[PDB]
Amino acid sequence: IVGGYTCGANTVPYQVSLNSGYHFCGGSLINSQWVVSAAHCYKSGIQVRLGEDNINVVEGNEQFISASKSIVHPSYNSETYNNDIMLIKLKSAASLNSRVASISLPTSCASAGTQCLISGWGNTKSSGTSYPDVLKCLKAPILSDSSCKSAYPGQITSNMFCAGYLEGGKDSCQGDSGGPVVCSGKLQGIVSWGSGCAQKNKPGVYTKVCNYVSWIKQTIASN
Ligand SMILES: N=C(N)c1cccc(O[C@H]2CO[C@H]3[C@@H]2OC[C@H]3Oc2cccc(C(=N)N)c2)c1
Numbered sequence: 001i002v003g004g005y006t007c008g009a010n011t012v013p014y015q016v017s018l019n020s021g022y023h024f025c026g027g028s029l030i031n032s033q034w035v036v037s038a039a040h041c042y043k044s045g046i047q048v049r050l051g052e053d054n055i056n057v058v059e060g061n062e063q064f065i066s067a068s069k070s071i072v073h074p075s076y077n078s079e080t081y082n083n084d085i086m087l088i089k090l091k092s093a094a095s096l097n098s099r100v101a102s103i104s105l106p107t108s109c110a111s112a113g114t115q116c117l118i119s120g121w122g123n124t125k126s127s128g129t130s131y132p133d134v135l136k137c138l139k140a141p142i143l144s145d146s147s148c149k150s151a152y153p154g155q156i157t158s159n160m161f162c163a164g165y166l167e168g169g170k171d172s173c174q175g176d177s178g179g180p181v182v183c184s185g186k187l188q189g190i191v192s193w194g195s196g197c198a199q200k201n202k203p204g205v206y207t208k209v210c211n212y213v214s215w216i217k218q219t220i221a222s223n
């Protein structure tokens, strides 16, 4: 997260870290047994880390649970990141508490201009590199589809939306991928892709979760 702020420990209780010996992507807890992330975060050997603030220090509220199954969206296209969504089942149910909590799925898509909360442990610099150990947060509005598609002609599908600031300065970044965009209490986006981080006229691109709620619900109920 570039241009954001330290969230505060466990203030984003649905945020998970995906760990394969190291943090490599975010995710969102949607019930005690399932996490939603980005398909481009797929790998085998995932451990889900819940209750995290400092990902390098055991602070006392963590739950570390191995993934038992990963399900990449059937239509994920790795060249274009169209349908950049994946489900991860936990080998054992998380113990839900005030620091380890699910986020609701949308019942409808969110409209342009709605303010959202984006969070993660990604790079915090727009030139160069600095990775935080505590969770970072950013408030950012959903941008119009026209502004999104103007920034990335040819590359935005109906399964994507842009959020952030055309002036630059404030964006998600490498290492935030797979993490949440929460708007009005609903998981509306997944950190997916962009051009650099926090550059002028190149807002972040997010998987449009409202298009996937039927697939999510049917998939989890059958697995
Ligand atoms: N600035 C950001 N908000 C952001 C967030 C996550 C990742 C990120 O950058 C990485 C760099 O490599 C990946 C992801 O962003 C770009 C590329 O994926 C795509 C996706 C869709 C189309 C194509 C394409 N070039 N045709 C590339 C930045």
Ligand SMILES: [Ca+2]
Binding pocket: 052, 053, 054, 055, 056, 057, 058, 059, 062
């Ligand atoms: Ca920790």
